[PDB]
């Protein structure tokens with residue numbers, strides 16, 4: 001280091017601050033974009049550059065060449081967290097700023113492009129090792145494995161205490177990306193917010209709020225400009241339909257979401273998702289963290305675009 005300030009071209013330097021930033025098709029710039037965000041979000045002091053670069057490159061190696069749950073998704077989800085953190089400067093601890101960008105980079109480590117359900121119906125060994133949040137416990141395990149590689153301990157300077165705290169932020173953050181857990185998390189947050197019992201000094205409350213941030217960052221394709229949203233959907237369905245193909249091979253009719261034969265019903269499926277998951281997610285997030293409102297606004301814009309698709313206005 002340490003007078004070594006990572007800098008991006010002007011258009012990226014400016015647009016990376018915005019919630020709707022797309023990290024672009026130049027895979028080789030994504031490590032630099034991540035380090036830039038860590039340095040601005042956390043400090044040039046939070047990580048040893050050499051260790052951080054080595055960690056980033058081993059995380060990249062441990063993402064697979066799948067249409068959606070790939071390295072680009074990792075860095076995309078990390079950027080959304082970067083935007084939340086930068087818009088809510090004073091709300092987050094030093095350990096949280098460290099832990100959360102890392103959790104986001106690692107949250108789908110070694111994803112195979114298949115749901116927890118598919119692993120369970122296939123009878124994958126991972127489903128016997130982890131009976132709930134199957135892939136998410138795997139992703140946390142892969143994160144700890146990489147932190148334990150030689151020269152990969154980016155947390156080396158933390159005390160025993162702080163190290164256990166940050167790994168517990170990461171573990172909870174990664175488990176929260178199981179969408180099965182999102183519905184109850186958000187219900188409890190919505191009740192807490194409205195009865196005025198929400199207390200960011202209650203650790204168990206902070207945990208829930210970080211869970212919702214994780215869901216929000218994880219679903220952030222719905223908060224992009226429409227051409228990004230639309231082309232990301234294609235990747236999402238490429239996995240869903242491959243999974244449905246695999247369900248048919250086990251002798252199981254897949255849900256329509258995963259049946260490529262029901263392609264025609266995608267636009268209506270997007271409406272349900274926006275209405276049942278996406279919009280409620282960003283709404284409750286905006287209630288808790290008012291400066292995240294652009295995510296809700298962008299989501300609503302994309303809802304309105306899917307409604308136009310149905311009306312054949314596109």
Ligand SMILES: Cn1ncc(Cl)c1C(=O)Nc1ccc2[nH]c(-c3ccccc3)nc2c1
Pocket residue numbers: 218219221222233236256257258262263265266267268269270272273
């Ligand atoms: C955008 N996004 N981000 C993260 C995630 Cl999970 C997504 C997503 O697409 N979710 C989603 C959720 C439910 C759906 N149902 C259908 C569908 C239903 C009947 C027929 C054809 C399709 N498509 C769906 C797509």
Ligand SMILES: [Mg+2]
Pocket residue numbers: 107108135177178
């Ligand atoms: Mg995941």
Ligand SMILES: [Zn+2]
Pocket residue numbers: 073077107108177218
């Ligand atoms: Zn993800």
